[PDB]
Structures are given as structure tokens and as C-alpha cells.
């Protein structure tokens, strides 16, 4: 709709919680692939958030996800 979908975060959030708030590209991706998530979609989300390019997504990176989602889909609309 805008930039990110709350539905996506739910998928990544759940898988992240299972790994202990921390997971690597390979582990999260496998957990994502088993849910029906495409590599392209995962790579975009992972690249988008993995600003450190450490090929790893942590609770910190995921935190921005929820924040970035609310600044767009929350507190505003038509502007």
C-alpha cells in the first residue's frame, strides 16, 4: 500500500522471536521460506533493514520495522 505491510512484519517478528530476537540471513530466510515467503521479498526486507550489511537481522533492526510501519500507516494518512 505505502512502503511496508504490517502483515510482513508479523511473519518476520514471529520467526525472530523463535530464534531469540536474533537470526541470520540463512536462518530467518529458511524460517521465512517455510512460511511461503519468496527469496525476493525476504531479500528486500532484509536488505532494506540490514543497513549494517552484516547479513544478520537482530531485535534492533526489527524494532525499526514496527516504527517505520507506524510512521507511514499510523499518525497520518492523506496528510
Q: Which is nearer to Ca ion, 26 or 74 (CB)?
A: 26
The neighbour count for residue 39, using CB atoms within 10 Å, is 11
Q: Is 52 annotated as a binding residue?
A: yes
Q: Which is nearer to Ca ion, 24 or 73 (CB)?
A: 24
CB distance 16 to 59 below 8 Å: yes
Q: Is 54 annotated as a binding residue?
A: yes
Q: Which is nearer to Ca ion, 1 or 53 (CB)?
A: 53
Crossing angle (nearest 10°) for helices 39-49 and 59-73: 90
List beta partners, residue 58: 22
Q: Is 43 annotated as a binding residue?
A: no
Residues that bind Ca ion in the complex, under the rule CB under 5 A:
50, 52, 54, 56
Binding residues for Ca(2+): 50, 52, 54, 56, 61
Amino acid at each position: 500500500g505505502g512502503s511496508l505491510k504490517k502483515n510482513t512484519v508479523d511473519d518476520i517478528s514471529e520467526s525472530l522471536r523463535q530464534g531469540g530476537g536474533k537470526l541470520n540471513f540463512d536462518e530467518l530466510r529458511q524460517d521465512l521460506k517455510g512460511k511461503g515467503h519468496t527469496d525476493a521479498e525476504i531479500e528486500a526486507i532484509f536488505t532494506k533493514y540490514d543497513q549494517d550489511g552484516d547479513q544478520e537481522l537482530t531485535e534492533h533492526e526489527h524494532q525499526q520495522m514496527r516504527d517505520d510501519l507506524e510512521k507511514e500507516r499510523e499518525d497520518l494518512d492523506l496528510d
